[PDB]
Design a protein around this ligand. Structure first.
Ligand SMILES: [Co+2]
Ligand SMILES: [Co+2]
Lengths: 504, 501
């Protein structure tokens, strides 16, 4: 009935309110909180997390969900989707026994300090005992989340971040990438080395106040609502807080402006999704949420990569760089394109350019999959990390675990099945932009970008993606939006056109 | 056994964790939140406030307190005090029916809107409907909070902010103030007028970045722990957030810097108490809270009035003004003292000098007491306000309710019985500083202030007040600290030395 469904709605509004507090508390801990407030803040967040957990895991919720589900056809369409999303949120908290949960929590908090130091010291052997336990915990986690579905443990884990994504499809997507991208990289490198184009590096200092002003200017170009969000400073840029009050951060160095500019553009792309997330009338409910991390990172990367690193945008950007920092030879649209699209393989994933980046992701996918499968053991990670690094990026890591397998925090913090979503995001972004250019026209999109007039583009994003939140399945959403399910051929054609053909 | 007590401790830690979130949300509301965030933020705070209420008022809590209390002798000194403070918190929440609390939140949220416009528009008539309801509400609230005590309803309201304070003691105190303050003010005005001393008002602009730097510098003089707190800007200066993370705010104008400086020093005096509140080991418990609004305001006024408006402090301050803003004729010791210590009765209590301030408080006390007692009704407040302002301050407010009875937010915000604590704080500050001067020596105290070297003074405040929180009754606390219960004669002699002599 409506009765139990509406009772669920009420419970989920309660949870949304408590989540508001947690999100604020988390935002503040990274931006405003002084160091001695840390224990108080963590104690407070833990207690509130506990209450949210007891609320969603009370016996009555399951009984409520079950009564609501027998009378499904008496609900409006969007209420039916909301009931689906409610079960999903309930299963995500309920399928892990509390004994497992506390054990995971203890190990991840342990695993963190052990990782951080070993990383800094290049000591995989000191990490390895922990790492073996993580991998056993993750394998155990997969099975629990798998439930009575018969899903592969890793699939159960990827599902946390990418609802409905199967290992079969993931293996097809990454196998597709593996068939062409390592040779594309090599082709691009040799083309760029044979050309020998002049690239003038921007010369600093770039005053941090002028960087901030430039960033806000670009947030205005993306029509960020500043009456419903903020820009501030943290050690790691992120997009956080709540949908009514979306708060992004960045970090500035005087020596360059690119990382921070492009970083803000990236987070603004996330923000636009959050600020415009529908469906309307479901604001405090789980159907009014981002569909997946791949869909979310598809929005950030649409902003950053599809618009931000384009030749057209350089035409708009260059004269703003003259205006905000003062003129210098580096500040021409042709030269800034060369700076922003420069291809240079390296060892560190977070520093990777648009082309190399998916190779870092692909390799993490394969290892994660293989560990979960039993094909390899923690023991072998360094060896296989090095194999893949030489193979995909032409670089060695043997003996350099610091910048090899120990470089990312993710496994310390109990995040397995997360990494692949980044390249899924890149693929979503390329697919969406292909559609937008098909619909609006190539010259129209280029004119919008080069003139910093994004409204027609942002409107298509809003229509196709943002207004739907989680009311549709990912497959349904992408089909409705772009004509088909997620297809990596768009990302391939984007990368070929931009890097191999220098087309923008 | 000790089981009920230790389970209550666990409950109050939970509540402390919840209050942390509410405190952060409230601070952020006034400092960082963009305007469209407002609805979601109010809905979140209300849901959490409800959960806290239901937690503390559950029948379980009553049963725990009753069980703990029947073996109160099996508890150590600080645990028995903590149990007293637990019962107090529970009674504060548990006494009003939930139907009452709903009505009040409704009425007050609406009252803030109508008050604000009526105030801007000088329209008591428009406000009078709301105000008759507020007064009816407060009389009902007082009776509810009194219960079977036999306390006057207004006493039960005063008790919320000033635990253990009786109306009889309040009447003894304001009666004392009335015995010397009027002849003092009168005398000071005719002294000032006969001298006709030159006062140079500082001339701006004062860049807000420079003001901020000066304000932070004085926070450092008070040894504010910036690893455990912040300064930020808000529409209305306050001291908030939590004890591990004390966040104070100010507002800046280019035309003058004094209000903001002294304001920051005031809030920093509050912050020092919150940053150092004991007892140690009871941090998440109600025993580790400020004793009263009177004692709290005592710490802020010790900072602001006892140190911050003294001649010795002007010796330190004047060279700092030159340093931060650049030299000008006004920036002398002698002249800044005259600016900061200036006496000029006016209509607006926030703007009142150290001498006139208690007169504004006394008139509100008298008016709140008469309203509660049914000696006047809401219709009569403008007339009575004028009469009391004429008698106390020499000033007519008739027809100017904007600068008369509608002046302050307190009544529309549901705060009755609050005003008296301002003067109690002034008295606590003066009594504290007496003991400090007696113990350290006048010369050592003056030396400390004039060199910006406040360590020895702060250490005394910490020892005497901050470290105890609510472990002692207010009478015990002041007796242990100062040798006696609150005595307004210290306040008298403070005002006499500063303004008459
Ligand atoms: Co992102
Ligand atoms: Co105060």
């Amino acid at each position: 009935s409506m009765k139990p469904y509406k009772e669920l709605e009420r419970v989920f509004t309660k949870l949304y309110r408590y989540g508001h507090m947690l999100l604020l508390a988390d935002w503040d801990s990274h931006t405003m909180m002084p160091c001695k407030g840390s224990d108080a803040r963590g104690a407070a967040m833990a207690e509130l997390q506990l209450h949210m957990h007891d609320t969603i895991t009370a016996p009555k919720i399951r009984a409520l969900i079950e009564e609501a589900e027998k009378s499904v056809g008496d609900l409006e369409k969007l209420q039916r989707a909301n009931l689906r999303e409610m079960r999903r949120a309930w299963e995500l908290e309920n399928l892990l026994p509390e004994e497992f949960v506390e054990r995971k929590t203890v190990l991840t908090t342990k695993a963190h300090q052990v990782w951080k130091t070993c990383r800094e010291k290049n000591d995989f052997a000191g990490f390895l005992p922990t790492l073996k336990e993580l991998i056993a915990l993750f394998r155990e986690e997969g099975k629990l989340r798998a439930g009575n579905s018969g899903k592969h443990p890793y699939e159960a884990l990827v599902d946390i971040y990418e609802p409905g994504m199967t290992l079969q499809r993931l293996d097809e997507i990454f196998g597709n990438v593996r068939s062409w991208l390592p040779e594309l990289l090599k082709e691009v490198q040799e083309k760029q080395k044979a050309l020998g184009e002049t690239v003038l590096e921007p010369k600093g200092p770039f005053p941090v106040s002028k960087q901030e002003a430039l960033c806000r200017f670009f947030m205005d170009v993306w029509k960020f609502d500043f009456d419903g969000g903020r820009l501030d400073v943290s050690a790691h840029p992120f997009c956080g807080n709540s949908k009514e009050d979306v708060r992004i951060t960045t970090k500035y160095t005087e020596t360059e402006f690119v990382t921070s500019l492009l970083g803000v553009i990236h987070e603004t792309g996330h923000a636009k999704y959050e600020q415009n997330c529908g469906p309307k009338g479901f604001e405090t409910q789980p159907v009014c949420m981002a569909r997946s991390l791949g869909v979310h990172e598809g929005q950030s990367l649409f902003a950053e990569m599809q618009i931000g690193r384009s030749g057209a945008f350089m035409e708009f950007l260059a004269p703003r760089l003259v205006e905000y920092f003062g003129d210098q030879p580096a500040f021409t649209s042709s030269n800034m394109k060369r700076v922003i699209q420069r291809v240079s393989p390296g060892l560190i994933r977070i520093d990777a350019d648009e082309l190399c980046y998916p190779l870092h992701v692909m390799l993490r996918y394969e290892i994660e999959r293989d560990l979960m499968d039993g094909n390899i053991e923690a023991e072998e990670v360094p060896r296989v990390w090095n194999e893949k690094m030489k193979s995909y990026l032409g670089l060695e890591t043997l003996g350099n675990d610091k910048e090899g397998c120990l470089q990312d925090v993710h496994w310390s913090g109990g995040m397995f099945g997360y990494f692949p979503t980044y390249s899924l995001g890149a693929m979503v972004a390329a697919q969406l932009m292909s559609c937008v250019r098909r619909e609006l026209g190539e010259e129209v999109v280029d004119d919008c970008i080069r003139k910093g007039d994004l409204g027609k583009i942002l409107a298509k994003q809003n229509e196709k993606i943002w207004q739907h939140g989680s009311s549709l399945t990912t497959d349904e959403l992408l089909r409705q939006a772009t004509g088909e399910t997620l297809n990596p051929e768009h990302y391939r054609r984007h990368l070929e056109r931009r890097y191999r053909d220098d087309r923008g």
